[PDB]
Design an enzyme around this catalytic site. Sequence first.
Site: not given
Length: 327
Positions: A64, A184
């Site tokens: 690849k 959060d």
Amino acid sequence: ETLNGGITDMLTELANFEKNVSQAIHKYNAYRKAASVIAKYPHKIKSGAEAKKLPGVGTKIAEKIDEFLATGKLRKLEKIRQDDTSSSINFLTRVSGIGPSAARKFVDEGIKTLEDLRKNEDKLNHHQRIGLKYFGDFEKRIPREEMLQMQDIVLNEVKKVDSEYIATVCGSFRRGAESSGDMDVLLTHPSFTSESTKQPKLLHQVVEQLQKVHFITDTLSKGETKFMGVCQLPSKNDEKEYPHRRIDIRLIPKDQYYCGVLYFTGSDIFNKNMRAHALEKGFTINEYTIRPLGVTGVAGEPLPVDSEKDIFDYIQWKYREPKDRSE
DNA sequence: CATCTG
DNA sequence: CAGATG
Ligand code: NA
Ligand code: NA
């Protein structure tokens, strides 16, 4: 960091794909170390064979890398970016509550779009529904200018419910950050800890308040210590309402707040380093505590912390304003 | 890791 | 209960 960039990037597309479209966890995991290693690697990979030389680097990948180095592209990468079935999954998945698994199910049933989904709200579950109902708001960043307003409310409501509560909004919000993706909140109370056997109310009463005044609009998931919701800053004087924002609230035993707080505040980079340093200093640190390191290899016993200070001290370090907790 | 679903 | 999601 930019020397093996494409290589690392193509590898990531590939990895990701394996896992999301295919079920290819092995393969998927394969692309990953490869990118990790080439990523560390010090030179310009001029060829597949050179890459191969590395560990995690096998023949396939090497091939690849070659084709990509050889020509600005990859056929497979090309074949995948096109493909509708693949695209759909990367898409459905943007829905909060739809993971790949579900993305796949739906596609095979033909839902491939927002519209599809709307038409089939019957097939979706609560989280997924909400997710769809606010697909937009959800992807919108959160300007700290709003964050400050949110924070302001949340904290006042907690205060009213119990003076003893201790809330903290960690996140990048905490590190400085101009905007954030979600809110959060770290939560504790003195009468809640390590041993102290539970107190679900502890978290439920607060949640309740927030919805009382309508800050919290929906509920994603609500356990005894973690709450995943949706909230919204009261639309002023009608003309400009706010987007719906994702919010999380979690109960923590008082005996491990600061570690959490520290921990959750990040950045991951700061963590690690603080983490590595602790280790030198003769310590161990994680999400919940800091432990003096034995010599036999390892060893436990919770060092006692009263602020983010106590932690640094321990490892003998410069207390870091959260702003500079960057790296 | 904690929560949900089915 | 396994398995999904965040
Ligand atoms: Na999703
Ligand atoms: Na299995």
